[PDB]
């Protein structure tokens, strides 16, 4: 017993020092492995060396910003005062310079590119104007979030699309995510056997979703996801000027699904204002999760375009949300509380993985049941429309025919050419009434038809559309905004915050409309930047 007591006392004395020493030893061993790998063959060790260098740089940056925050603020303070003193006259100069730059760039670039590249900008203006017309509180609107959101969308699109080094990186990331979800697919062969490929949707895709959920739970436990969310949220906060919680949610939704994104700020969900809740819902509807990215890339959709649309949607979502539902009440939640995100209660990484996997049970069942019901309803609608048309000697009437004409103006305003506008409208209708999976499947069929080659017109029916229309469709359809998703989001949010149940239902439909409009704005910018083939 005496030896046990002495050992306990010794452990108590050196606890912090022992933890520091063991962590340092582990880090030193990792560095030794890296240096040995570099010594043996640097070319093979290049990725590990790059990862180590970037990790060290980020850690040093974080430590410096933490420790020296006061000094940096003191250094920045005089500049802010000088700018404020001269701001009154200088604001007009800045605005005039920005307008002149916009005019010059638009004229030169878009005029040289062609007429269609300019209709995209026209559609962007039209969409922003229409959102302003039908706003909840038109009189009280803050234009800084809207203008900064559009500017950030433009800058990100310009960098990613007009620069080859930017273009390649997103393709590389898309390939990596596809490979990760391919690893996901293989693991599900055990449970359902090697004949799991027979039932493609139920066996591959739903385990893909489950594995993504488990991985996200594990990363949340480790504390990586939170870091990236904080970085992007700080960028949006320091530029757009939005509230902290809505910014954090918007940053999270880029790689998190709509259902699980509010869990980031669940503890403060009861106290959020109506505007912030509408912003949360709009961000949820306007961005897709990482799980579907692999499947969509597999269909044939471009990885770079998908990732660019996902990144660009969040600023668009916030801007459109602010313009649609401007805030009229003070925000109670503080920045420090919002940025802080509680880690998983799971004791160890494997418990976090188990808890993350278990949650997915409901989601897959809901998705499958909803798909079955809505596809059956679509078949019945097609049969009934065909029956009705036969009376008037037009037996070809169907859901697709109606949706082609109904949604054509939106496709045309986005910058698609006249002929392909109907085809894009069909996809937009499929995305609206049914989940985007089917619309992306149709788009992949069209892309395959174009790639194979052959007659553009087998008969008076067009078979495939141009590359630029495909890019614009990829941007437009990158969202979870569906008439079926409306119910599940309402249910989940009301479950998280029962007190706010009355508020959640009121703003859901406006949130869905705002999400669709944000997708349209992203498509407009992409069309404006992409050249005609």
């Amino acid at each position: 017993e005496r030896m046990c007591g002495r050992m306990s006392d010794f452990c108590r004395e050196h606890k912090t020092t022992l933890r520091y020493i063991i962590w340092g030893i582990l880090i030193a061993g990792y560095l030794a492995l890296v240096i040995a790998a570099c010594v043996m063959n640097f070319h093979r060790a290049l990725p590990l060396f790059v990862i180590t260098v970037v990790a060290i740089f980020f850690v040093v940056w974080d430590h410096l910003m933490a420790k020296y925050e006061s000094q940096i603020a003191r250094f920045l303070s005089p500049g802010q005062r000088l700018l404020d003193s001269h701001w009154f006259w200088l604001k007009w100069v800045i605005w005039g310079c920005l307008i002149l730059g916009v005019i010059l760039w638009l004229v030169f670039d878009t005029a040289k590119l062609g007429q269609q590249q300019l209709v995209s900008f026209g559609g962007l203006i039209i969409y922003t104007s229409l959102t302003f017309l039908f706003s909840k509180h038109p009189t009280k609107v803050y234009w800084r979030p809207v203008f900064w959101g559009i500017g950030l969308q433009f800058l990100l699109g310009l960098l990613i699309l007009r620069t080859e080094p930017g273009f390649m990186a997103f393709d590389w990331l898309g390939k990596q995510v596809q490979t990760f979800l391919g690893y996901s697919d293989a693991g599900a062969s055990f449970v359902f056997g090697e004949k799991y490929t027979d039932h493609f949707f139920a066996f591959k895709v739903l385990p893909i979703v489950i594995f993504f959920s488990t991985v996200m739970s594990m990363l949340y436990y480790l504390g990586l996801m939170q870091w990236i969310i904080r970085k992007v949220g700080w960028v949006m906060l320091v530029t757009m000027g939005t509230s902290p919680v809505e910014s954090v949610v918007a940053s999270g939704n880029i790689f998190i699904g709509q259902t699980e994104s509010p869990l980031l700020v669940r503890p403060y969900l009861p106290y959020v204002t109506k505007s912030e809740l509408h912003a949360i819902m709009t961000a949820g509807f306007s961005t897709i999760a990482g799980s579907v990215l692999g499947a969509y890339i597999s269909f044939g959709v471009s990885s770079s375009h998908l990732l660019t649309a996902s990144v660009m949607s969040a600023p668009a979502a916030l801007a459109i949300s602010k313009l649609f539902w401007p805030e009229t009440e003070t925000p109670k939640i503080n920045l420090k509380n919002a940025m802080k995100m509680e880690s998983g209660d799971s004791r160890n990484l494997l418990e976090a993985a188990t808890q993350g996997a278990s949650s997915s049970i409901s989601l897959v069942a809901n998705i499958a049941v909803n798909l079955i019901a809505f596809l059956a309803l679509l078949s019945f609608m097609n049969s009934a429309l065909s029956w009705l048309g036969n009376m008037f000697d037009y037996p070809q009437l169907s859901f697709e025919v109606i949706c082609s004409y109904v949604f054509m103006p939106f496709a045309f305003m986005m910058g698609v050419d006249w002929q392909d506008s109907f085809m894009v409208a069909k996809l937009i209708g499929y995305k609206t009434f049914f989940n985007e999976f089917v619309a992306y499947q149709q788009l992949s069929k069209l892309i395959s038809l174009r790639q194979v080659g052959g007659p553009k017109f087998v008969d008076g029916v067009q078979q495939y559309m141009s590359m630029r229309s495909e890019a614009i469709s990829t941007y437009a359809l990158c969202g979870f905004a569906n008439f079926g998703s409306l119910g599940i989001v309402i249910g989940g949010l009301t479950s998280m915050a029962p007190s706010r149940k009355r508020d959640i239902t009121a703003g859901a439909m406006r949130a869905l409309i705002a999400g669709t409009i944000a997708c349209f704005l992203t498509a407009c910018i992409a069309g404006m930047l992409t050249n005609t083939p």
Copy 2:
């Protein structure tokens, strides 16, 4: 801003007028489409014209009954007083006339028809007498509900079976329902692939259930289901004299499943009396849902017989409920509250569809798990009985052999001939211990064997039974009354009304027995009316 305010004021002024104008314009457009279709070719447009005519007739009837209710009541009032004044002597005359008519009809028709058809009437009397013997409160019984229920069953059966125009309509409706669910069958190919036919029960049937649930939720939101329920409930109320809530529930169960039927009067479940709760459970157990109708028709079961049994069961269920558990306490719930049914809270039709689809998740899983467990138990029971019989040199002993002898008297009393009574008893045992699905499957196998033709007796074992026995089996087995299904009904009812859990548990078994007896009474009437082949 001023223009927006003026527009808002103008919209506020004409709100009701604008809604009326837009609805009228839509109706006028529909009428124009109908008239154009009739002009072009009346023969093709015949169904649309008939539907429009019947809809207009029903709308006008409803409007007139609403507006002129007081005038009609005033006109009816003197007749009621005159009847009441002379009722004392006239009641004996009416009863004697009814008895004489019953005697004449029974004698002529059944005596000419044969002996077996008369045993059906004998069995009807026997079942009613036995129910009266073992009533909860034999002294206090109201015979008007029982007599009116039997009379309505007889009238509906007579009309549907003995008249060709009545017989054809129910076949037509059965075909329509079959096609309507076939639309669901196709829709589930997407989720489970084109090889879904490999696993027949799990893939086709459960999506059939899901689609039926979604369609029922959508119709409930629109407000059609409620209309038919109100009409049939009013008929039963004005003839049988039962309480309003039980009548509403019974009318709904004709096309609604037992699990979802109480949702019609969910808000008033806490305050219902014990007798009304027993009536609800009996109505739930004695009728089948619309979802299984398509599958059962597909197996080979006659559509007209299935629909006729479903329609006839509800009056039988109410009459047997009243006789078995007569009410001894006053009914609190009013007619207006009961007939009024709150529409779905879903904001839009598609939200209603999603919510209806989501609820079905539990039901399908419960059905699958229960079927797996009970079929495994059946296999074990057969193996153990065969093992025991071999000791006594009878290795063929099995569940079917015992159930053939055990349930033979019930089959014989229903009017089935002596030879086929054992085969009907096997089906009755399968229906009692396991769901009606397996029993209908066996009946379909027997019907196919009869239709193919061949030896009636391959050996001393009979292979198939006569057509009339098949009809009586179709009537007898049209119910959801099973031992396995007892638990789920109790769970659902307790979930809806936690306060009444003690009342729910006490009366479940009696309700199940009452439902089985109501099914037997319907089978007896069908046997009485159907001629010997």
Copy 3:
């Protein structure tokens, strides 16, 4: 009415007499059937006669012990007093005799058997010593439970393994269980079709689990399971000296899963001491449920070894629990309350079956989702380790390679030979990180490779291992202790006893360690007793 009243009075008078008479008549009929079967052919009727004889003997024994308990206690009392009077000097004599017998038995047998058999006893000593070193309260320990637990384990292993009559009985029981669950396998063909064999794990095994749950619920309602639990618990209580509640829980866990084990003493969970809660958790972690027994036997694992390990684990679990976390506070719960177990509230057997089947829905879904997630994580881990190894010119690095070296000492201390220690270590790592199912699958693959025959070494990689190593692996891996089960057990126990939630969370890891240590002790005993092939 008067006749009904007279009948009711007559029934009330003879209630108890009538019930006794009807039960006696049924028993007499069963006896007549048995005697007729014996008359016709005794050889065929042997099993039924044996079952009847054993049942009669057990009923008579229970009745006699009930009625004559006071007389037996009075007869036993003088012996207890005489032993207590002379215990002071006699205890040393007893301990010395036990030690001398242990020395003689160890020397004579093991020295003859070889070096390998003795390392198992050495490992047993090492494990006990290590558990004693790191005890929660090392100063205060009661050694009688530990010594008696080890003695009972040794005796049971000796009887079952070294005697042919004992060895055959467990094989017979295993075959019976395998057939009993093969009955379940057939029953699931209906729901999933005759092509259910295509998806082996999802369709066969999960229905096996469902059927086991249903049968266990039915037996719990009938009241058989409780009888066996009481008998074994009384044996453990009268020999080991543990508290009644922990003994009751441990005895049940032999054939009951960890999740449902505390429901036996749920009402008293709030008042249990910390040590008793630790014992409950340890017993839960160290034993497998009956459902997996059929599947594991089907894979090829020996039935006798599986059943022997399951039986032996509970005494080992209790002994290790007491040694690791000794009790420091008084037990409030009484023996009578603990032994008494409330029966299921289900009204009839079929309601119990339905309720048992319904409960299994969550378990199967959780198991499938966890398997998918963890297998995907394993694939990703193997790919990443292979990528890292290639940099250092060792592309074969993988999870198996690391776990072979990491867990080798544990395998060696159990008595496995040097060459097979690494192969056993891979299985131990699989069991620790993932559920025992995958480890047993790998063991079955190895057993099949051995049985088929061929090269022991296709190359410098060993292909299959010896029989004794397979037996030791079977003993070692018979547990539910996994890093993922940590969360599920904590959640389940905390759901039952919110008051003790903090204690449940505090003492989970120690129980998880103790379960693996107890499994290792059982494996050590099995290795010590099993001869080298």
